[PDB]
Design a protein around this ligand. Structure first.
Ligand SMILES: Nc1ncnc2c1ncn2[C@@H]1O[C@@H]2COP(=O)(O)O[C@H]2[C@H]1O
Ligand SMILES: Nc1ncnc2c1ncn2[C@@H]1O[C@@H]2COP(=O)(O)O[C@H]2[C@H]1O
Lengths: 132, 133
């Protein structure tokens, strides 16, 4: 990881309350694994039916989940967790509702996070079930 | 280190350009060792003749170095390096000029910083000589 992206991530990570549950050591691992991304309003982030190799956290702006009755997720929310939990394809297309700032986490690092944090693992699990 | 202090340190170290010379791994060890402090305007930070066991980095506000002609140091500046390098007592009293936000580093962690970053070590050494002369 480059120093520029790393230090930038620390500022971005503050926008996701979920990570307040991590101690310094685990926080560093997650911050090292996260990748910042800006998506313009209306643009596809993930597509229904596709294999999920990563999940996302919303920093700023919002996204639109294309369920029958679409759901708009805001800062602090996460999406892409269902496929990572079930192994099944992406259950819905998710697009930028407004221009959105994101933090992406790959499946391997997602697993490491859940292994490191029982509390966070269950939040993902309950949220996925609630969404299913 | 507490999670709160750790996370707050990341925001504060951004104000110290010197630390841009550190990669992610060394940066973490430094952020772990730093302690944040706010000092009210006019209040003593360093005392002349006192043994040096730590140094400081200015995050916000400014400090006044009590040399014959006082020097006001601003954000990104450092002080207390001279005693740590030479082993001599503090060369001058340093006080908050305005209310100041600081980051302090103990002597043991100063050694770690200098070893991890010989570039930074050189800045300290040259600056110390400059301030000495
Ligand atoms: N009913 C729902 N409410 C909110 N978000 C959802 C819902 N269904 C799916 N999503 C999100 O959209 C994502 C699409 O990819 P995933 O199935 O991996 O994970 C999904 C959830 O994060
Ligand atoms: N001439 C000077 N100009 C600027 N800063 C100084 C000067 N002399 C001393 N200092 C700073 O004040 C500090 C007092 O403690 P130290 O001697 O350990 O380190 C000193 C320097 O950081």
């Amino acid at each position: 990881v480059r120093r520029g992206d790393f230090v930038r991530n620390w500022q971005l990570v503050a926008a996701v309350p979920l990570f307040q549950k991590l101690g310094p050591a685990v926080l560093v691992e997650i911050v090292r694994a996260l990748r910042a991304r800006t998506v313009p309003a209306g643009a596809v982030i993930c597509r229904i039916g596709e294999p999920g190799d990563r999940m996302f956290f919303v920093v700023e702006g919002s996204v639109s989940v294309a369920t029958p009755n679409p759901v708009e997720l805001g800062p602090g929310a996460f999406f892409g967790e269902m496929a990572l939990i079930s192994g099944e394809p992406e259950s819905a297309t998710v697009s930028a509702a407004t221009t959105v700032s994101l933090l992406s986490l790959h499946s391997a690092d997602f697993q490491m996070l859940c292994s490191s944090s029982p509390e966070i693992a269950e939040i993902f699990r309950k949220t996925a079930l609630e969404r299913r």
